[PDB]
Amino acid sequence: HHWGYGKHNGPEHWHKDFPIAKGERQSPVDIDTHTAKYDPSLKPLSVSYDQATSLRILNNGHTFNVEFDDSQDKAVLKGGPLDGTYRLIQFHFHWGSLDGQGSEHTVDKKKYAAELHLVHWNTKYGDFGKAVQQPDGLAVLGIFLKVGSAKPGLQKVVDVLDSIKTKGKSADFTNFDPRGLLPESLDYWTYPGSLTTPPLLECVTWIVLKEPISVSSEQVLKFRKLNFNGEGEPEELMVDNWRPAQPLKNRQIKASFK
Ligand SMILES: [Hg+2]
Ligand SMILES: [Zn+2]
């Protein structure tokens, strides 16, 4: 029926229902580190997550989202290549069936085990819905995950996945601190792009962190136990929910470091 990541409804078919899939600023893209332009005018990133208020976690059929209360400036992002304040609304992951694939963005063609997306919207627009109608309405912070040592801050998420195994399930998920998922450095690459899932809107200013965070094999294995299907339907493991790199076209990737 509708979109997914299968052979019959995967990324290569999306253009039929969403023509913008073939647009001019689609994501993700491969980050060529030797062609990326170091820009000295880029400001440091400012991440203020101390007053964050997580609310719920849900399995939407294509991934699982952890939602936040965005009714006030509680968890915001500013600085870097951004003008204005951006509010955190939710975060989700993309992962593979094996450790050698899973990330959407790649660095010099290298694929990571998973990629975390922290989604924020420009407050000047009032709400998320109005933000997705503007070229600068969203800011997404992307973080690569590699397999190695366990990430303590990620365990609370891993432990709740059992309760939201199938499509449609949700669970209260309060008091989660996002700061536990940030790498040590905030050096980044930035370029103008889009959401990586339908409707594939081109409203995103991407901020991809250079430093990946490490998670254990046992932790990523938990992600692989989720289901695409709803309860009672035949089981389809939620794996490889990532979109392949898209043509950079008329865009330049800028680096905050050299
Ligand atoms: Hg837009
Ligand atoms: Zn995403």
Swiss-Prot record:
Changing residue 195 to E/H/R: Strongly reduced CO(2) hydrase activity. Substrate binds at residues 196-197. Changing residue 104 to D: Normal CO(2) hydrase activity. SUPFAM superfamilies: Carbonic anhydrase. Changing residue 60 to L: Reduced activity. The keyword Phosphoprotein applies. The modification Phosphoserine is found at residues 163, 170. Activated by X-ray, histamine, L-adrenaline, L- and D-phenylalanine, L- and D-histidine, L-His-OMe and beta-Ala-His (carnosine). Changing residue 140 to G: Weakly impaired activity. One of its GO terms (biological process) is positive regulation of cellular pH reduction. Changing residue 62 to A: Reduced CO(2) hydrase activity, rescued by 4-methylimidazole (4-MI). Reduced proton transfer. Enhanced proton transfer. Enhanced proton transfer capacity. PANTHER family: CARBONIC ANHYDRASE (PTHR18952), CARBONIC ANHYDRASE 2 (PTHR18952:SF120). Belongs to the alpha-carbonic anhydrase family. This is Carbonic anhydrase 2. The lineage of its organism: Eukaryota, Metazoa, Chordata, Craniata, Vertebrata.
